[PDB]
Amino acid sequence: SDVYIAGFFPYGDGVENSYTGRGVMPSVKLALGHVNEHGKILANYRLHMWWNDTQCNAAVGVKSFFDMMHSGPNKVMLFGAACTHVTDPIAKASKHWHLTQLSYADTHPMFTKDAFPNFFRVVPSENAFNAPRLALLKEFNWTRVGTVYQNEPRYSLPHNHMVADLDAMEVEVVETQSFVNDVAESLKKLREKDVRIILGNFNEHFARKAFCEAYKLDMYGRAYQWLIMATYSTDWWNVTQDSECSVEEIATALEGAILVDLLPLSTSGDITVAGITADEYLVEYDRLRGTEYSRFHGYTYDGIWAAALAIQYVAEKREDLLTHFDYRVKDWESVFLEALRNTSFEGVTGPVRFYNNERKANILINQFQLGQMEKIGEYHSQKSHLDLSLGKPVKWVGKTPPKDRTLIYIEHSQVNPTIYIVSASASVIGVIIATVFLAFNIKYRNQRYIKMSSPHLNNLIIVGCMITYLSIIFLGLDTTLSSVAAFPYICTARAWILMAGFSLSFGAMFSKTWRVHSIFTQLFMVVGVLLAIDIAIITTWQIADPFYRETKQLEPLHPENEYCQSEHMTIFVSIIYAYKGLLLVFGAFLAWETRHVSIPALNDSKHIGFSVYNVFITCLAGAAISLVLSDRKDLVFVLLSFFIIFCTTATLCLVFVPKLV
């Protein structure tokens, strides 16, 4: 009446991952005592754990396993080691002894059923951290996540399964970074795209380095959301090992990060198979544990209970457990395998039940808030459910979860009725004044006005002045007030009428200047001739170069220009501007030459010269601002409309009939 189990622990002194061995042995003793002191579970049996200290060494573990196989009482099961490189040789070697191995702390994501048929895992693997994080992406709307993971296999297969699993959930990976020793480069590559939700797989030291860099480069919070697996030590951010970032500095980048970890004990009030709730077992473990602690104490307790269950099943089926146990006989293993597949019991860590070979265990989810790691909720994997109300409320930086994709709206420009309404009113007043001056010129054939400059040319220049105001109103109109399909025509109205304004206003003065030029040593058709020089070319705009607006959205800070045709402009508009400038400089130079010539039968030549001078300077300034300061149409209009109206009013006031008493 004595059944034995073989156990492998990282015990003794200073060995790597020793805390996982010295912190679970009290739980092993607790479970052994509870099983032995329990009825109706196994009778005429006494579960004895023969355990050996595998000093985190693949050789010591194998030697210990061979020692317990060669000599001593027949061990009916293996309690797997807590280190991957220790249990893997044992798992490979024990397959020819027909033994079933049960792990208590090994989370490595490679102990799958196909490679290790006899390796059952009470503690879930790292792949079990994929589901909770991807659950949070469903709770808070995040459909665009970046992934950075350590190149080690322990943080590689879980990442591959994650990126192959979030595909079905309409979540698009933006980037995938796999560092080796430098996380800063991975973070810079991640920021190359505008990704805000990050999923990270790395160890505690590399987590400290990653948040070190995430402070170095600005990813501190309020816009960047983190989602990492955190099976680290307690207060891992408090250990000073990163790149000089102090604890009061590594915490700033950690604020508002969601971390998924293994739940140590079940928080439900269910009664375990031991007859005591998880809280009573926790009290017993805290009393009999002293100073050592490990997150796997409940898991190793449940592993010992599962081993007892499997042995009870084997005894119930095969009566000759202690008198016919042979390592070389295969069927025994099969029986235990079946005994380990019918395992379904409530333990101190939840419902223990092996699905493929692993166990679906609840995943604790906590978040760094106010310089502390506060529990947020639990992800139940048996019945997949993200209970976020169990722990503290999810504290966001601000009032809203960080957005997966940055949003900046853009809606046109050129507006502010005022800038336009005041210009329209000024143009209305200007055309009113022009019509008043036309009426004052209508009273011709009366003394000086009869003998002054040709009043017909005066009506032509007044028509020019009014059509300049019509031109500025047509040019200022935008696509938000009129139909977009009317953009070419108004663009044509931007050109043609403007080309009219120069023709009927500058040409009228040019004809008088040419007369004075012909004098120093039937005629107004020259204006029409000048009109030709534009109208024909304007036709060549429409016939072969249709207008196409270019919408350029440039620097949309926390607007897009609607300029005219996207066609030949440095070949066409440059020609127009050069020809106009040639006319301007010609008129100015002949006016300078014809300064003090009185030459009666054509009066007010000096005022015509003054008008041509102001036209020259104002047109030069307007062309300069149009070809240089074309930032947005609003600024161009607010800078050019005043100049245009001032110059036009000067032209229509200087020469018409100033006072003449």
Partner: protein, 695 residues
């Protein structure tokens, strides 16, 4: 009677069942260790063995059975890398040395996991120094890798990359497939690679071979570094079974001219080994012994692990030599090899020291072990020519000794390059064209200076006396400068070093602008003075305006030169196919266009200044049809010439920018047009003067 343990993968499925030939060979060595020689003075070395079937679980079971039974073992022999890792990593606990005859995994080279592991089988990363030496021997620096990603080729490729970074070899691609390389070898001819190293098994090797004919990745422009330990006829076997759509003829055709680098497992020389026989003699004896086991190798069908039998033989001989030295050192006292226990550290350490200092000629060559337990092997290089392997040479990795037999048959007679080398050639103006233009410009300068000298009659005769001679002198001096600028416009980088080419580039613009300004301070400003005199109705009112024009354009040119000059904007063109060379040289043309930062701004400013002056002069000459003046008597000619000069300057500048990318025609037009602009504007002004002065 010393005992050793052996694990031989004989009766298994899959993996490397190399024990089938490696078990008898050891047996032979056993005899040659204990039967004939006095190698063990009073000892008979025995070997207890069992099958592992090339799996780690059965290897561990065999190791347990050997190490936990009555006959004490002093050494463990293991086969494949899985069993070698299973045994060697756990061997330190029992204080045993593990010698592996068939462990080629690079992961076994770390002494921390395996403190007592020796491998007489060369590691998989032993060809990499040889591949790099071959790459540096033919001048190749751009190479690509075609992997299979089997956890063994990853380590070899990593070692190859790290060694390449120490040799300057640049890797273009790292294409890696798993089962089908179609979408892994197709991208090879996207980042076009000529030198490609293949890191796959034979099963993937045949498929890769079949996937480089329809992709046309073979021939004179590509070289493949295949793995050298395939079967000799590895391209004409297992055809129908695999999805190889290709044929044996094309199987062989593209196997031509590929280099295979291999670890030597048989002694290439005829020297007698320490075993008492040569490599060929051992091969014959092994052939004789293997047919007893049930093999018909007389008509081929060799057993698995046949190529590694010398490794097992030399492993046993190394064990025997190390044991002999161990007892020779141990005689200085009472401890012996017979009284050995698994807890005896001193004897195990002595045996480790003996196995460290082993250097003997065995069937596989000079057997010795490196500091990390790896086998120091002499690599061998061969090349497949017409479906047969010819040995190019051998390479010693420890010390650079590349014994080369010059039998490499490169197609075309020359080593292929690692890329299509591009050569940039400067397109220049045609030499006869430049020479003719320079001669014409020299004639123009000569005739201009002739007229300047002829202007001696300024006081003597009234025709030139009443023609404002200073204006004509200014015109001629501008013509000379502008013709010199024309000469400087044909001097491209072919005639001057590029480091001083921007000097000529700036001088061209400076001289041209100065010459044009001086040629219109006399062709247009004289017309302006004529018009002003006619309207208002002498020498200061012309020279001052000339000086003002010179001041403004000199300020513009000085600002252009100081604030933002032009250096070089050598253009490009499509990669031209050169003359017949039967080689991959791509010749690309480059021009010598000048371009400043704001070249458009400066050019527009200068051209607008010139155009304003040109239009002013044209219109003034239009007003100067017939207003002949007594003191400026040549007012009708130097106006007649303004028309043609204006039309030339308004027809040259526009089309010049259009044809500026054509080196010859652009220079030809910008030279001939200026030649005419300075020839008719010279003749019309001065030949009537010469006709009138003498008659």
């Amino acid at each position: 009677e010393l005992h050793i343990g052996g694990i031989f993968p004989i009766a298994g499925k899959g993996g490397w069942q190399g024990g089938q030939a490696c078990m008898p060979a050891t047996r032979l060595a056993l005899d040659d260790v204990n039967k004939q020689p006095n190698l063990l003075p009073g000892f008979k070395l025995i070997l207890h063995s069992n099958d592992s079937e090339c799996e780690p679980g059965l290897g561990a079971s065999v190791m347990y059975n050997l190490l936990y039974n009555k006959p004490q073992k002093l050494m463990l022999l293991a086969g494949c890398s899985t069993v070698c890792t299973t045994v060697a990593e756990a061997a330190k606990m029992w204080n045993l040395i593990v010698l592996c005859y068939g462990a080629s995994s690079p992961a076994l080279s770390d002494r921390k996991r395996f403190p007592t592991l020796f491998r007489t089988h060369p590691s998989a990363t032993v060809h990499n120094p040889t591949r790099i030496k071959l790459m540096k021997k033919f001048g190749w620096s751009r190479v690509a890798i075609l992997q299979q990603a089997e956890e063994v080729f990853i380590s070899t490729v990593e070692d190859l990359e790290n060694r390449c970074m120490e040799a300057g070899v640049e890797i273009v691609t790292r294409q890696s497939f798993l089962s089908d390389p179609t979408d892994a070898v197709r991208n090879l001819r996207r980042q076009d690679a000529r030198i490609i190293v293949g890191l796959f098994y034979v099963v993937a090797a045949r498929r890769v071979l079949c996937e480089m004919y329809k992709q046309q990745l073979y021939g004179r422009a590509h070289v493949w570094f295949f793995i050298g330990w395939y079967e000799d006829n590895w391209y004409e076997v297992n055809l129908k079974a695999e999805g190889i759509t290709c044929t044996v003829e094309q199987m062989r055709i593209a196997a031509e001219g590929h280099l295979t680098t291999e670890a030597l497992m048989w002694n290439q020389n005829n020297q007698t080994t320490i075993s008492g026989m040569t490599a060929e003699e051992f091969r014959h004896r092994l052939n004789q012994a293997l047919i007893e086991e049930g093999y018909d190798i007389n008509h081929d069908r060799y057993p698995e692990g046949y190529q590694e039998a010398p490794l097992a033989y030399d492993a046993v001989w190394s064990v025997a030599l190390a044991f002999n030295k161990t007892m020779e050192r141990l005689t200085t006292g009472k401890k012996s090899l017979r009284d050995f226990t698994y807890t005896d550290k001193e004897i195990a350490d002595e045996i480790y020291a003996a196995m460290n200092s082993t250097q003997f000629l065995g069937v596989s060559g000079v057997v010795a072990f490196s500091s990390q337990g790896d086998r120091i092997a002499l690599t061998q290089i061969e090349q497949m020519i017409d479906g047969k392997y010819e040995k190019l040479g051998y390479y010693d990795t420890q010390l650079d000794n590349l014994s080369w037999l010059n039998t490499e048959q490169w197609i075309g007679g020359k080593v292929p390059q690692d890329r299509t080398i591009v050569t940039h050639v400067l397109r220049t103006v045609s030499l006869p064209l430049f020479v003719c233009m320079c001669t014409i410009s020299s004639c123009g300068i000569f005739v201009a200076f002739a007229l300047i000298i002829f202007n001696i009659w300024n006081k003597h005769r009234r025709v030139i006396q009443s023609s404002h001679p200073v204006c004509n002198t200014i015109m001629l001096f501008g013509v000379i400068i502008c013709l010199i600028s024309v000469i400087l416009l044909g001097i491209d980088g072919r005639f001057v070093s590029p480091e001083e080419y921007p000097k000529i580039c700036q001088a061209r613009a400076w001289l041209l602008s100065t010459g044009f300004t001086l040629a219109y301070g006399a062709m247009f400003s004289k017309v302006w003075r004529v018009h002003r005199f006619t309207t208002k109705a002498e020498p200061w009112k012309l020279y001052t305006m000339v000086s003002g024009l010179l001041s403004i354009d000199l300020v513009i040119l000085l600002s252009w030169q100081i604030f933002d000059p032009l250096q070089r904007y050598l253009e490009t063109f499509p990669l031209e196919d050169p003359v017949s060379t039967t080689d991959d040289i791509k010749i690309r043309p480059e021009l010598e266009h000048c371009e400043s930062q704001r070249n458009s701004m400066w050019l527009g400013l200068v051209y607008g200044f010139k155009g304003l002056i040109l239009v002013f002069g044209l219109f003034l000459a239009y007003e100067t049809r017939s207003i002949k003046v007594k003191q400026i008597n040549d007012s009708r000619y130097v106006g007649m010439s303004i028309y043609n000069v204006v039309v030339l300057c308004l027809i040259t500048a526009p089309v010049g920018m259009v044809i500026a990318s054509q080196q010859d025609a652009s220079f030809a037009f910008v030279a001939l047009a200026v030649i005419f602009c300075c020839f008719l504007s010279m003749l019309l002004i001065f030949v009537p003067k010469v006709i009138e002065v003498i008659r």
